[PDB]
Amino acid sequence: GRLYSGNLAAFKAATNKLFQLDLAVIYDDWYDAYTRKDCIRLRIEDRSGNLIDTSTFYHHDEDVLFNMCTDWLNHMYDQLKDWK
Amino acid sequence: GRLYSGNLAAFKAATNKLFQLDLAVIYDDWYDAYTRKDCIRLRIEDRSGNLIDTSTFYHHDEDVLFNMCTDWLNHMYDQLKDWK
Amino acid sequence: GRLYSGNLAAFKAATNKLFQLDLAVIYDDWYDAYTRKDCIRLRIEDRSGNLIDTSTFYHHDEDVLFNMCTDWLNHMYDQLKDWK
Amino acid sequence: GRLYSGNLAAFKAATNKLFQLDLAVIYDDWYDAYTRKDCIRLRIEDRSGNLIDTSTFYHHDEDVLFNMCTDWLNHMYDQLKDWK
Amino acid sequence: QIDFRKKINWHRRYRSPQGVKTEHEILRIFESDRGRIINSPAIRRLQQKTQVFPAVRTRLTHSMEVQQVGRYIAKEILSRLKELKLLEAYGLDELTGPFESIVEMSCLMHDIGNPPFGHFGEAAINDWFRQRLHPEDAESQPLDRCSVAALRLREEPLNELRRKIRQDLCHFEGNAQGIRLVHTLMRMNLTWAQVGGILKYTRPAWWRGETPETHHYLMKKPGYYLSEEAYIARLRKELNLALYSRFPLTWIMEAADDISYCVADLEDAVEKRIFTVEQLYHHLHEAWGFSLVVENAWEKSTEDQFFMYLRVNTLNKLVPYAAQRFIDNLPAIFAGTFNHALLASECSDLLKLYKNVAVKHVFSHPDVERLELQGYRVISGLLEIYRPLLSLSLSDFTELVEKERVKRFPIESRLFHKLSTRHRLAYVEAVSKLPSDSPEFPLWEYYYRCRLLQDYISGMTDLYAWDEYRRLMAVE
Amino acid sequence: QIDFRKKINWHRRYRSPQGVKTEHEILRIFESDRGRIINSPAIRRLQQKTQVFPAVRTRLTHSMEVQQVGRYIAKEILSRLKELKLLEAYGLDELTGPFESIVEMSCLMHDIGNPPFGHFGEAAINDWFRQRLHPEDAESQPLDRCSVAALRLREEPLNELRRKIRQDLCHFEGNAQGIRLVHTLMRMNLTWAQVGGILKYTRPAWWRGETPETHHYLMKKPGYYLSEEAYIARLRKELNLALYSRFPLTWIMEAADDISYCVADLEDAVEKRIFTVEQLYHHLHEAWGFSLVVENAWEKSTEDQFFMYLRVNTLNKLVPYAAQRFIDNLPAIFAGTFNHALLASECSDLLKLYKNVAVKHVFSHPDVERLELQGYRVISGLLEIYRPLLSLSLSDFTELVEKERVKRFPIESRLFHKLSTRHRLAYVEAVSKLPSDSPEFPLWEYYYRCRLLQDYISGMTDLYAWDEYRRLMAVE
Ligand SMILES: Nc1nc2c(ncn2[C@@H]2O[C@H](COP(=O)(O)OP(=O)(O)OP(=O)(O)O)[C@@H](O)[C@H]2O)c(=O)[nH]1
Ligand SMILES: Nc1nc2c(ncn2[C@@H]2O[C@H](COP(=O)(O)OP(=O)(O)OP(=O)(O)O)[C@@H](O)[C@H]2O)c(=O)[nH]1
Ligand SMILES: Nc1nc2c(ncn2[C@@H]2O[C@H](COP(=O)(O)OP(=O)(O)OP(=O)(O)O)[C@@H](O)[C@H]2O)c(=O)[nH]1
Ligand SMILES: Nc1nc2c(ncn2[C@@H]2O[C@H](COP(=O)(O)OP(=O)(O)OP(=O)(O)O)[C@@H](O)[C@H]2O)c(=O)[nH]1
Ligand SMILES: [Mg+2]
Ligand SMILES: [Mg+2]
C-alpha cells in the first residue's frame, strides 16, 4: 500500500539530474473531490522564476503515479537537453 | 480528608467486641439529597434474624461520623451486657 | 581468631539451662592492665536480687575463656540442683 | 563566576589569527600578592625567538581580563599588518 | 478582650532572648527561623517523596503552592481590618510582619512528618504493632494476648501506664510525628509561636474513650505523643491556651491545604496522557451540572493556559470568603474553642467538583493503585527484619548501646549500627533521665525503644526504603 | 532626582491594566505574578537538574536559599532608609510591598534558562555550531568556510544581516535564554518591572568588537538575542533605561547569588562522606591563615549544628555591608551606569576562603569530573541526530510544517514530530510575520529554524536528555 523505496529514489535521482542543468521543480499534492484518486502537480522553471511548463497527474495508486511523474521529468530533461 | 486508620481499627474492634456476644451488625452508607453530608445506618440483630434496634448518623466528616458510630456500638454493647 | 559459633551456642544453652531454675546471670567483660589477657566476670543471683556467688576468668584466647565460663556455669547448675 | 565559553573562543580565534602571520604567543598566569586580582602576561615573538613586545594585565574578573587580552592581541595583529 | 501580643511569642526554649525588644529586632527573630527552616535537612528530603505519581509535583512543590495561598489569606485579613480601624485595638499595630511569616512557615512544614509511601505507609506501621500489643485487651480489668511480659496486665498504679503505653504505640500519625521531629530529633529550637502553628489537633495519642461533644472536631485525630506531654504543657502555658485548645493562626493553614487539594493532581494527570485538556473540560462540564471560573479560563487559552487562569479565578472567589469567615468568628477562634472549619454554600460545593472528578478518573488509575499495595508490603517487611532488636532484654540492649562491640550478639549488633546517629542520641538522652531505681524503668525503656524503631522507619524517602528492603532480603 | 515610581512599572504587554490604581490593588497585581511564577512548569523542572552532585541540593533547593538572602538585603535597605527619613523623598512610601516581591521573584527564576548539564552543556552547543557557521570569517570583507549557501558572504546591505546571524547563533547563554523562555515560549505575561529584574547583562549576542570602557563590566557576557531586539527596546522605553543600562534592583539579586556560591556544596560534600566535619574544620582553619564566624559555630554544636550557625554568622556580617554599599552609590545605581558590583576588604576576602576550599577538595573529585565529560558527549550526539532537519530546503520544510504527512521525507518527518508543540507554535508565529516577498526571507527562516532547534535541546532535564540519547542510538 505504501510507496516503494526504489520509486522515491528514482524520483529524487531524476529531480537531481534535471537540477544539474540549473533548473528547479515545485511539487504539489492533494486529493480530488469525486474522481477518488490522488493528484500531483509539477512545475518546471529556471532560477530566475520564469515558468517553463506544468503538468498534473491523477491516480489512485502511489507507485504508478510516482513512476509517471518520474518518466515525465525524464522526458522534460531529454527535451531540454536536445537543445539548450 | 481520608479516614484515619485508628478510627477504622477502633470501629472493627467494637464490631468484634459485640460479635463476641453471638450478635451481628449490618452496615449501610450513602449520600443524602440536600443536607450535603454522608449518612451511615447500622442495624443490630442476633443470629436468628430478630432485629433489635437501628440507628442512622449524618455528618460531612468521615472521622467524626466513624467515631459516633463506634461510640454508639460501644453503648449498645454496654447496655446489652448490663443484662442479658 | 574470632569466637567459634559452637562455643557461644553452648554458653547460651548453659545460661538457659540455669535460667530454667528461676535464676539469672550477669555478664561483664573487659581487658586487664598488664596481664595481657581478657577478663570475664559472672555473677549468679536469684530473681529477688540476692547474690549467690561470683567468679572471674582471665585468658588471652576467646575459645578457652568461653569454655571455662560454660563449664563453671554447668558446675554451678549441678551444685544448685544437688539440693534446692 | 567561571569563564564564559565565548570569551575563550574569541581568545583562541585571535591567537590563531595572529598565528596565521607565522608568529607565536606565550601565556603566563598567576595571582598577585596584595592587589587581590589575577594577572596574565603575554609575550609576542616570531619563530626565530626574537621577542617583539610583552604586556601584563591585572583584574579580579576572568571575563574582563580575557576580553582585555583578546583586544590587545587584536590591536597587535592590526599594528603588525599595517606594515610588515 | 482580643490582644495578639499575648499570642505572638518570640521566646525560645534554650538560650531564650530576654529583655524588652523593639519592633525591628522582633522581626529579626522571625527571619532566623525562616533561615533555619528553609535550610533544614527535613525540608530537602521533601523532594524525594511522591504526592500521587512517582514534571510531576512532589511534596516540596506542593507545599510551595500552599505557602502562596496562605500568604494571600493573611494579607486579605490584615488589609480588611485596617478598613475598620481595628488593627490598633487588636494589638496588631506592630506585628503585621511575623503574622504572615508564621502562617507561611506553618504552611511550608505541614507534611514533614509523613512516613514513606504516605497513607498506606501509616497503616502498615499501625497493624504490625497492633498484633504485638493488643490494645483492646487493656481497656478494662485484667483478662491477655500481649507478646511482652512487662506490658501485660497483672498492680493498679502500674496498669494505667501499661495501657497508656499500649494504646499510644498503636497510634502513629504524621502530625504528631512533626512536633517530635522539630523539637527532639532536629533540635531546630524554634519560637513558641512557630511551634503552635503546626499543632493541628489536640487529642492525645493515648486517649481511649469518647471525646467531649464541645471538641468533637478538634479531637478527631491524635495530635501529640506521650513522650511530648511535658513539652506540650509548657507550650500551652507559654501561649495561654486551655486544655484541648487550638492556636488562632492554625485555621488559616488548614484552609490553605483544603484549597490546594485536587487541582494540582488534575493538571498532573494531563501531563501523563491519562486524558487530554478537552476531555478534562468535558468531564468537568458533565460533573458540574463554572462559568465565572472554568469557562473564563477555557476561552482565555492550551494546556499551560487553562489551569493558569482557573487557579486565579477560583482564588479570587475563595480567598475573600475565607477572610470573612475568619473575621466574623474572631472571639471563638482567639479563645481556641471554634469547633468548625473556615470552609455549606456555593463556595464549599465548588471544591467537591474537583474532589469527585479526581477520585473517579485519577485516583482509580491502575498505576496509582499498584504503588499503594507495593508500599504496604515494603514497610511490613522492614519491621520484621528489625524484630530481633525488640526481643532482647534490658541488660542485653544496655550492653549493646554501651559497649558497641558485643561478642554474644553478632546479628543484633550489626542491625544496631544501621540506625541513624541522631535517633540513637535521642534515645540515649531520653533514657538518661528516668529514675533507675524505680519499678517503671522497663516500661519506659521499652516505650523509648519502640519510639526509636518508629523514628528510623518514618524518616526515609520512598526510594531509599525500597532499596534497603531489596538489599536486606538478598534480592539486589 | 531619585523617584522609584518611574521604575516600578505594573503594566503588562497584553491586556495591560489601565487607569489610576490605589496602593491596595497595586499590591494585588504583584501577587498574581507570584502565583504564575510559582505554579509554572519551568520552575517545577528545576528539581530534576543537578547543581554539583546528581539529601543533596538541586537547583530548586538552591534558588530557595538565594530567595531568602535577597529578602533580607531588601528589608535591611528599606529599614535603613526610614531611619534617615528618605522613604517619602525617594518615592518608596507606597511601594515597600512590590520592592521585596520583585527581588524575591528575580532571585527565584535566576537559573530557569540553563541547558542540561550546565556549563559543559553550554559549551557543546557553541562548538557544534561554530563548525557549521564559522563566525570568524565574516568579520571583514568577503574572503569562506560556511556550510550554508544563504549565509555565505557574496551585496553590502545583505552581508551585515549575514554576519549578525552567524555571530548570534554561536553565542548561547542561559541568561539570554531566560528572557526568551519567559516571554515567547511560556507566555507568562509578567509586568515590566519583573522582567527587568532578570536582565543581568546588556551586551547583545551579535556584538563583535570592543565594548566601551564605561560599560566593560556590564557587557562582559551576552544579555539577549537578536529575536528579542524589538522586545528589549520596548522594555527600555517602559522602564526609562538608556542604552546598555541596568535595572536598579538587579544589583541586589547579583549579591545574593555571590553569598550562596560554595557554602552549600561544602555541606553537600560531608553528606557524601568525602570527608568529615572535623576534617572540613581543619581544612578551613589551614586555608584561612574566622573566629567570629566559624569558631562561634564550631563550639555551638555536630553536622546539622555547625553550618546552621555558620550561615547565620556570615549573613550577619555580609548583609549590612551589602546594604551600605547599595545605599552609598545610589545615584549611579539608579541611573544604571554603575560599573562595579556590591561585593576589597575583610568581607570580600572571606568569600574567597570558601571559594578556594571548594575548588580544591570538592570540584576536583573524580565522580564530579566524570559527569562533566559524559554530559558534553550527550549534547553533541543529540545535535548530530537532528542534523538532517537543518539540511532541508525552504520549500521542503514549509511542506513539512504545513502538511505534516509527507511521502517524500519519511525520516525527516518523524524527527519533526518529536519536538514540543510550544516550540513549533513559537516558530510558526515567528515566521508568520516576515515579509514573504523580500530578499531576506531565507536568512530569517534559517535563523528561526536554528533557534527552534536550540530551544528543544536546552529545555530538557539532564535525566531526560540521557535517556533520549541512549534510545535514539539503539542502545537501550
Ligand atoms: N507502522 C506502519 N505500519 C503500516 C502502515 N501501513 C500499513 N502498515 C502495516 O503493514 C501492513 C501492510 O504493509 P504495507 O507496507 O502497507 O504493504 P504490503 O501489503 O506489504 O505491500 P505489497 O507487498 O506491495 O503488497 C498493514 O496490514 C499494516 O499492518 C504505516 O503507515 N505504518
Ligand atoms: N569481616 C571480618 N573479617 C575478619 C575479621 N577478623 C578476621 N577477619 C578475616 O579473616 C581472617 C582470619 O579468619 P578468622 O575468622 O579470624 O579465623 P581463622 O584464622 O580462620 O581461624 P582458625 O581456623 O580457628 O585458625 C583474617 O586474616 C581476616 O582476613 C572480622 O572481625 N571481620
Ligand atoms: N493516592 C491518593 N492520593 C490521595 C487521595 N486523596 C488525596 N490524595 C492526595 O493526598 C493529599 C491530601 O492527603 P489526605 O490523605 O487526603 O489528607 P491530609 O490532608 O494529609 O490530612 P490531614 O493531615 O488530616 O489534614 C491530596 O492533596 C492528594 O494529593 C486518594 O484517594 N488517593
Ligand atoms: N562542577 C562545578 N560546579 C561549579 C564550579 N564552580 C561553581 N560551580 C557551581 O555552579 C554555581 C555557580 O555557577 P557558575 O558557573 O560558577 O556561574 P553563574 O553564577 O551561573 O554565572 P552568571 O550567570 O554569569 O552569574 C555554584 O554555586 C556551584 O554550585 C566548578 O568549578 N565546577
Ligand atoms: Mg497538604
Ligand atoms: Mg545561582
mmCIF file of C-alpha atoms and ligand atoms in Angstrom, chain D residues 1-2, chain F residues 51-52 59 62 111 114 119-120 173 175 200-201 220-221 257 260-262 265 359 363 368 372, ligand 4:
data_model
loop_
_atom_site.group_PDB
_atom_site.id
_atom_site.type_symbol
_atom_site.label_atom_id
_atom_site.label_comp_id
_atom_site.label_asym_id
_atom_site.label_seq_id
_atom_site.Cartn_x
_atom_site.Cartn_y
_atom_site.Cartn_z
ATOM 1 C CA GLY D 1 31.978 33.045 38.240
ATOM 2 C CA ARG D 2 33.650 30.773 35.713
ATOM 3 C CA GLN F 51 23.810 21.575 40.991
ATOM 4 C CA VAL F 52 27.016 19.566 41.505
ATOM 5 C CA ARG F 59 18.613 23.920 41.512
ATOM 6 C CA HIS F 62 19.467 26.251 45.733
ATOM 7 C CA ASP F 111 18.516 29.760 36.625
ATOM 8 C CA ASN F 114 20.361 26.908 31.904
ATOM 9 C CA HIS F 119 28.374 24.786 31.816
ATOM 10 C CA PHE F 120 29.662 21.911 29.686
ATOM 11 C CA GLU F 173 23.896 31.978 27.128
ATOM 12 C CA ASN F 175 20.594 34.411 30.908
ATOM 13 C CA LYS F 200 21.728 40.661 34.224
ATOM 14 C CA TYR F 201 23.881 41.849 31.302
ATOM 15 C CA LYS F 220 31.101 41.077 29.879
ATOM 16 C CA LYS F 221 28.569 38.418 28.758
ATOM 17 C CA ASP F 257 23.951 34.693 44.371
ATOM 18 C CA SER F 260 25.358 31.445 48.328
ATOM 19 C CA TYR F 261 28.050 30.245 45.941
ATOM 20 C CA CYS F 262 30.097 27.474 47.656
ATOM 21 C CA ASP F 265 28.472 22.465 48.233
ATOM 22 C CA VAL F 359 37.597 24.123 44.078
ATOM 23 C CA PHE F 363 35.122 20.291 42.415
ATOM 24 C CA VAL F 368 32.238 15.170 39.672
ATOM 25 C CA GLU F 372 31.201 16.701 33.086
HETATM 26 N N1 LIG G 4 31.164 21.330 38.875
HETATM 27 C C1 LIG G 4 31.398 22.610 39.187
HETATM 28 N N2 LIG G 4 30.418 23.362 39.663
HETATM 29 C C2 LIG G 4 30.802 24.625 39.934
HETATM 30 C C3 LIG G 4 32.050 25.168 39.760
HETATM 31 N N3 LIG G 4 32.057 26.496 40.147
HETATM 32 C C4 LIG G 4 30.839 26.728 40.538
HETATM 33 N N4 LIG G 4 30.024 25.636 40.437
HETATM 34 C C5 LIG G 4 28.590 25.547 40.785
HETATM 35 O O1 LIG G 4 27.862 26.442 39.961
HETATM 36 C C6 LIG G 4 27.330 27.532 40.745
HETATM 37 C C7 LIG G 4 27.561 28.852 40.049
HETATM 38 O O2 LIG G 4 27.722 28.700 38.624
HETATM 39 P P1 LIG G 4 28.939 29.357 37.866
HETATM 40 O O3 LIG G 4 29.176 28.568 36.590
HETATM 41 O O4 LIG G 4 30.121 29.476 38.741
HETATM 42 O O5 LIG G 4 28.386 30.779 37.423
HETATM 43 P P2 LIG G 4 26.988 31.540 37.451
HETATM 44 O O6 LIG G 4 26.689 32.095 38.774
HETATM 45 O O7 LIG G 4 25.942 30.586 36.884
HETATM 46 O O8 LIG G 4 27.183 32.678 36.399
HETATM 47 P P3 LIG G 4 26.472 34.007 35.916
HETATM 48 O O9 LIG G 4 25.131 33.706 35.362
HETATM 49 O O10 LIG G 4 27.435 34.613 34.916
HETATM 50 O O11 LIG G 4 26.441 34.882 37.138
HETATM 51 C C8 LIG G 4 27.999 27.427 42.112
HETATM 52 O O12 LIG G 4 27.084 27.841 43.125
HETATM 53 C C9 LIG G 4 28.296 25.941 42.223
HETATM 54 O O13 LIG G 4 27.151 25.235 42.698
HETATM 55 C C10 LIG G 4 33.095 24.347 39.245
HETATM 56 O O14 LIG G 4 34.268 24.644 39.020
HETATM 57 N N5 LIG G 4 32.678 23.053 38.978
#
